[PDB]
């Protein structure tokens, strides 16, 4: 997160860290056994870290659970990043508490201008690299589809939306992929891609979760 703020310990209890000896992507807990992330975050040997704030210090509320299944969307395309969504099953159920809790799936799609909360442990610099120990937060609006497509001609599908700021300085960045965009208590977006971070006229692009609710529920029911 570039241009964000320190969330505060366990203020985003659905935020998880995907770990392979280092943090490499985020995710969102949607029930005690399942995490929503981005398809491009797929890799073997994932450990899901819940209840984290400082991801380099043991603070007492962590739960480390290995991923037992990883299910990319059947029509994911790694070239276009269309359908950039993935479901991770935890080897064992997480213990739900005030610091480890799920986020609701949307019942309808969000409108342009809705304010959302974007969070993650990604790079905090638009030029160079600085990775934070503690979770970072950013309040950001959903942009109109017309502005999104003007920023990224030929690249925005009906399963994507832009959020953030065209003036630069505020964005998700490397390490935030797979994590949440939450609007009115609903998981509307997944951090996916963009041209750089926090660059002028290059807002962040996000997987449009409201298009996948049926698929998410069927996948959970059958795995």
């Amino acid at each position: 997160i570039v241009g964000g703020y320190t969330c505060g310990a366990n203020t985003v209890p659905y935020q998880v860290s995907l770990n392979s000896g280092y943090h490499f992507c985020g995710g969102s807990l949607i029930n005690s056994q399942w995490v929503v992330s981005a398809a491009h975050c797929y890799k073997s040997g994932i450990q899901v870290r819940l209840g984290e704030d400082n991801i380099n210090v043991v603070e007492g509320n962590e739960q480390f659970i290995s991923a037992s299944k990883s299910i990319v969307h059947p029509s994911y395309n790694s070239n276009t990043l269309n359908n950039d969504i993935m479901l991770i099953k935890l080897k064992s159920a997480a213990s739900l508490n005030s610091r480890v809790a799920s986020i609701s799936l949307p019942t309808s799609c969000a409108s342009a201008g809705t304010q959302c909360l974007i969070s993650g442990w990604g790079n905090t610099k638009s030029s160079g690299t600085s990775y934070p120990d503690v979770l970072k937060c950013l309040k950001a609006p959903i942009l109109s589809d017309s502005s999104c497509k003007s920023a990224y001609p030929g690249q925005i599908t009906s399963n994507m939306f832009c959020a953030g700021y065209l003036e630069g300085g505020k964005d998700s960045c490397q390490g935030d992929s797979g994590g949440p965009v939450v609007c009115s208590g609903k998981l509307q977006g997944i951090v996916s891609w963009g041209s750089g971070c926090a660059q002028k006229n290059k807002p962040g692009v996000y997987t449009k979760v409201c298009n996948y609710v049926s698929w998410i529920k069927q996948t959970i029911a059958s795995n």
Binding site: H23, V191, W193
Partner: peptide, 9 residues
């Protein structure tokens, strides 16, 4: 281009 560690384009 993606916001993973490492990024993919």
């Amino acid at each position: 281009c993606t916001k993973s560690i490492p990024p993919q384009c």
